[PDB]
Amino acid sequence: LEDLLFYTIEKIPVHKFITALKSTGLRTSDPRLKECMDMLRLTLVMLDKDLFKKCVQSNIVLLTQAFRRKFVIPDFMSFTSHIDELYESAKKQSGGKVADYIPQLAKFSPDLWGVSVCTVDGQRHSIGDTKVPFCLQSCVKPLKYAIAVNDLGTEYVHRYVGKEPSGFLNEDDKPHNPMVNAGAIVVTSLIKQGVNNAEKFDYVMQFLNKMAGNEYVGFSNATFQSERESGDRNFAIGYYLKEKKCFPEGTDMVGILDFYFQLCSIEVTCESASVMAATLANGGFCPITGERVLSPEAVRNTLSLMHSCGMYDFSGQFAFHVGLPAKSGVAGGILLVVPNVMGMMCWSPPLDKMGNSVKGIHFCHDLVSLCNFHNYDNLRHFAKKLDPRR
Amino acid sequence: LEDLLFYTIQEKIPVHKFITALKSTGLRTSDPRLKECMDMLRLTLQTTVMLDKDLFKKCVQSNIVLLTQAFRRKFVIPDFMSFTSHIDELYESAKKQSGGKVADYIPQLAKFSPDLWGVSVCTVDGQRHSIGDTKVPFCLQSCVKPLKYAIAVNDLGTEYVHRYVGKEPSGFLNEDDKPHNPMVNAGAIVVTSLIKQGVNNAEKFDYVMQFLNKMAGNEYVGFSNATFQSERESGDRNFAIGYYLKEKKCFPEGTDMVGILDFYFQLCSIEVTCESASVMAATLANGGFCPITGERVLSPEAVRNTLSLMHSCGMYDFSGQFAFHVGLPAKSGVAGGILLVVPNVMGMMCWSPPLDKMGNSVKGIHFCHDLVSLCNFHNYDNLRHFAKKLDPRR
Amino acid sequence: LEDLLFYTIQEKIPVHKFITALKSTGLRTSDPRLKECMDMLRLTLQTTVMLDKDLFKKCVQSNIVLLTQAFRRKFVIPDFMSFTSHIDELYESAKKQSGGKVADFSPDLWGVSVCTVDGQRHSIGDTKVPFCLQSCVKPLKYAIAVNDLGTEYVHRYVGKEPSGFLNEDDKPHNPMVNAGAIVVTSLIKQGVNNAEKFDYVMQFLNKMAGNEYVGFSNATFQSERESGDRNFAIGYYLKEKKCFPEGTDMVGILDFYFQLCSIEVTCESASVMAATLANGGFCPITGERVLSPEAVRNTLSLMHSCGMYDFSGQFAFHVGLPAKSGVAGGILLVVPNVMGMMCWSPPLDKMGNSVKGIHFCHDLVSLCNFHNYDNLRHFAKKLDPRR
Amino acid sequence: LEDLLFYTIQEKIPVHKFITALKSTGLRTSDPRLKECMDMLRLTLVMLDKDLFKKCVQSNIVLLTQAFRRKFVIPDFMSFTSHIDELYESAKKQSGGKVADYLAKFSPDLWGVSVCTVDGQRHSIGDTKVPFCLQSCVKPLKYAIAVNDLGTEYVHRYVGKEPSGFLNEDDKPHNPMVNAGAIVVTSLIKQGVNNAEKFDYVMQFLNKMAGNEYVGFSNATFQSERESGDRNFAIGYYLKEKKCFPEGTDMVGILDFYFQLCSIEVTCESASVMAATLANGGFCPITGERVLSPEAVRNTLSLMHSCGMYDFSGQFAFHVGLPAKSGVAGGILLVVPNVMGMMCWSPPLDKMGNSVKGIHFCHDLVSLCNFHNYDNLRHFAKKLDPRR
């Protein structure tokens, strides 16, 4: 196992192993690599059979699979080369306008652009401004919906909200889906019922942590305050939803919107969020931690509704061309999921008429032109498309 | 080579025991890709029941690759015999769903017994299974919409086709005045206008028929003149659509709209069985390559576009719900057929005449829900973690 | 002058004889226009029961003109007694229709008040029972806005046409829908608090009613206030689309809005308001000009098209009279140039309109040609009260 | 009787003097109801005395008395037509809008306004006697015939009573004023008969309404409507599909009848009598004949009010406050209930599909006079009332 892996790389200089590992896409920071990385820390510049396996033994299974090219993208280093090329073609689109409707959204420089990819195997790549935290805004919708369905199951959740695109309420007298603001609001009321906004938020927060594999998650109070004061439309919705009895019994609405606004102000970076999208691409299992955050039905349902409802008015166009479930938000983030392969976060503040990141949208189209990630792309015949999984 | 495979089935090998092993891969002896081998076997049985290396290699030599993959269980569904057994269970479960009304609006659709129910599977590897009434021919009707839309996009390309017709569900014309998509009648009619322009219907129809043959691997494709006459006569709302389309200039220049409507009804009147249709379905599942004949019928462009639209628009008003729960591109028609594609896996046709309020076959819809509950074919199901679903792929 | 009148009713005229002929013109002795004359009779009765050219003239002098037109049969309904006879018959017929559901007031409560443009009054049923204007206030308050701010201003904020939340211009559809009524409410007496606002609208409402009963139900207000989720939704959507005038406090505007819906009237009191619109802005009993013709016309047009909720198209077609209904069960009904009236029954039909009222309005038009498009010269079988 | 009249008009009465007086009440010597009295005048034909006057005038003295005793709706007509002129001139200066090309022959310069009161008083200015197709203006007329023969309950079994805002909740067209409804109405009239007979009937009906003034048919327009009528065929098949026609209806035929109806020709003059008939409660003002039941006239006016102007109907009914019908030929059939009716014709149409000049004229008409539905008769403020 370890021995086998040992030769694969009479004495192994650590830095040689480190690079070999970093080329598989895995990060030394990987939670699943801790024991091995610690063991390396302990020993620390060259390793031998007995010793190597001493460090590696604990993680050997994951290390073997990285080195013996069994990850979803066998050649990651090449794949990231294309990601960079794509990232840069999109960088060249300066159009669109940053949402100014609140000061926190206005602050952001138009030229912040980043793409963070995390596969279902935990292979990571980043380019651009990945580490800059920004608000999930509408990107939180699929996430909290996932939490909702995960906790309460599909049937309960959809007693309250619809399964399809509108085209305020539908014929059943419920919001059309969780991706619209009315739907999202209703969903917000389903999560952790009978508890105060503080604990509710803590719960959701801890849940987003699991999804991120404990990568950066935060809260913008500045954004929250601005969301609250300027939230007149959301209030109009709340009051309508209340009058239509769309909420669970014993719901304090004004609280649900307070809660709702908070979720929208939850902060992420491209990195942290790409892992969240990976958890969705991995069937509920966080790729880096390996823990099961969400139930498959919750993930399935979410991926469905990001497909149909995800892009706002660009959803149909998006689904037809990109053919991938994705979530957009006013922050300029696009949470993009390629099922069974990877997930990613694209962030640029400038948005188009539809309200989606211009660069992100551009990048998504490009990404799918290049590789066959399109839902209806065929695995055996994809014509001239590049397949990163081979 | 073949040689290795001989040991993969004693010194001398009964012919019938080679057959049953082959037939168990889900493959059929009728397979066009098996012909050279199947013929050597039939010929050899003349020169007489049993074989030896050299004699075996004599028969299997041409088709070994396919035969090797089959006996090396390298096909999509490695255990086909087990998978089909589940299909039969789901079939029986749906057979118990007698609700729904057969479409009476014309004599040809009313002629059908409410109890005609069949399912046919064809994988991308040519593995076949059928149960219920597979052999009974019925009109595609709306099941033809994706197929003819595939043809247009194949010939004319995405960009052109969608100048005339839209890419998304309606939710008569969209904002740009094009029909909403190829899946609605307004769209299907427009698309019908795009195929084989500048020729008379007879040749247009023949072209479309050629195409359909290739897609069915030359299995049964036919025409019901009875239905065509009745579609023609009763087609008032299609004509309304035709005139609105002409008035709105949705058709290409020089289009003859009354003729395009004749062509349209003709296409709706094209006949298939569950078997022949399931192969057409598997082609879309196979990225444009007919799973049984190995020929490339459709461009990946066309196939992808079609699957997307069948996903969003294919189930009528049950589309949103269908895509959510079943999560497979599918197409329903008044005939009671459901053209179902599981990408990268297989394709199938479920046929029952009784329709639900949405217009979809009751037993079909029921079967499709069940199908996805059992196995993870749902678009967004995970290949690694599908919980307690079963995965025929392994 | 009055001389003539004298001989129109022997050497001496018993007073009762004068009152009874007067009350037959449909006029009421309480008519503010009759005050002087009636004051004089009560005084003469103190200085005692008969009148004479000099005594008479002394009483009827001040009021002659009205009293003259009254007895020259020159009012709009020349024969009132015979008209009110039919109203009573129409009342009893509609009374027999008990279908409908009360808002959640007895279901049995039903009543009709007629006030013509000449001040002629008739009342039957429970007409003194006070009830909330509710949506019946919408036209009245729109009339105030148009009156004060002019047509062009008011309609910068709200639309003139039936809906078919906001229209293409992002204004509410009209003053008759809630969104439109809430916006309109925002137009009246800007820059002042709700107390002074409410008074202003109330004094206006008093003039329209000829100072007849106008009141406010706080019980209703508190209810409409807590249960108002629908309107608060509308208030925020309105605020979000900037449909209000700059510097509007919407939460305050909504409170004002609930206040206007809670204003109480009676069938009688209200019928005068209706007759005011029928009179081109002049309260028929006082003679004061309450509203501008511009305002009165705009209101009637919108009551015609938008007034009955979803029954507007059907009501305007068949009845052809501008009218407004409210959840309280009242129907504000105006016959232009003729009269105005208030039908009130609590039980409502599926449309939100009073079962009895709606029935009455249909009956009314079938009998008399008041229909917008009925003809004055050839009405066929319809009776014409103006002759 | 007539003796009374005679003194009103010295010992003897030069005929021309009676003419000009007669013509000044707005009446026309061409007036059908004056026929007997006009006959007698040429019979005698340059002065008249009692006997002789009473001889010629006796015939119709009730009309001549009313006219000369200013008992007509507009007592001072000669003043009123002066304002109509001013209004006409004011409107004639609107050069905006486009002629319907889809008629192009018609010069955009053509503008005319014909007035006919409920008393038979006539006035014309601009291009009155140029014939033009009713087109959509025929819809209310068509509907009135239907409701006249078939009654309210039957006609509205097939078509709706209210504005749209293709079919309504009941699956019937929204009203007679939309092509869908108009087509349906057309299938209602004179059923069980061939289009040749159907057309003759509607033609005779329209004649009545016009008091036998010009009514005609443009085959040119008709052929063109048929060839370009794809929209109407689409509607036709949809109606057929939804079973909106009476059973046994030949849908393709109806469309043809429909096309023919839109191609019927009127002049501002003949058409104003039609509108006047609708203003007079179904009685043709000039003939005196009863053409339409009050039921039909009332229903027609209601629907013209709400549905008449296309998308401008709401804006129109609000401001103008008069029932009217507009058409692609640039015609506007305008009805003032109980007062008069008129046709305003200019080819160029605004974005709404309404005659630019006509619309402009109507607005001016109601600003000047209180003909507005909800204008008050006692207090109109600063408006002008032709009825006094």
UniProtKB/Swiss-Prot annotation, chain B:
Activity regulation (UniProt): Isoform 1 and isoform 2 are activated by phosphate, due to increased affinity for glutamine. At phosphate concentrations above 10 mM, isoform 2 is more efficient than isoform 1.
Description of the deletion phenotype: Death during the first days after birth. Pups appear normal and display normal levels of activity, but their activity is disorganized. Pups do not orient to the dam, do not succeed in grasping a nipple and do not feed properly. In addition, they display altered respiration.
Effect caused by changing G171P: Loss of enzyme activity
Keywords, sorted A to Z: Acetylation, ANK repeat, Cytoplasm, Hydrolase, Mitochondrion, Phosphoprotein, Repeat, Transit peptide
Cellular component terms (Gene Ontology): cytosol; mitochondrial matrix; synapse
Entry EC number(s): 3.5.1.2
Outcome recorded upon mutating K58E: Increased stimulation of enzyme activity by phosphate
GO MF annotation: an example: identical protein binding
Positions contributing to substrate binding: S142, N185, E231, N238, Y264, Y316, V334
In-chain residues carrying the UniProt-annotated modification N6-succinyllysine: K23
GO aspect biological process, one term: regulation of respiratory gaseous exchange by nervous system process
Enzyme class per UniProt: hydrolase
N6-acetyllysine sites (modified residues): K167
Superkingdom field: Eukaryota
Catalytic activity: L-glutamine + H2O = L-glutamate + NH4(+)
Free-text description of this protein's post-translational modifications in UniProt: Synthesized as a 74-kDa cytosolic precursor which is proteolytically processed by the mitochondrial-processing peptidase (MPP) via a 72-kDa intermediate to yield the mature mitochondrial 68- and 65-kDa subunits.
Known role: Catalyzes the first reaction in the primary pathway for the renal catabolism of glutamine. Plays a role in maintaining acid-base homeostasis. Regulates the levels of the neurotransmitter glutamate, the main excitatory neurotransmitter in the brain.
Domain remark text: A highly mobile activation loop at the dimer-dimer interface is important for enzyme activity. The C-terminal ANK repeats prevent the assembly of the supra-tetrameric filaments.
Family, as annotated: Belongs to the glutaminase family.
Subunit structure comment from the entry: Homotetramer, dimer of dimers. The tetramers can assemble into rod-like oligomers (in vitro), but the physiological significance of this is not clear. Interacts with RAF1 and MAP2K2. Interacts with ATCAY; the interaction is direct and may control GLS localization, negatively regulating its activity.
Descriptive protein name: Glutaminase kidney isoform, mitochondrial
Organism: Mus musculus
Stretch of the intact protein here: 144 to 549 of 674
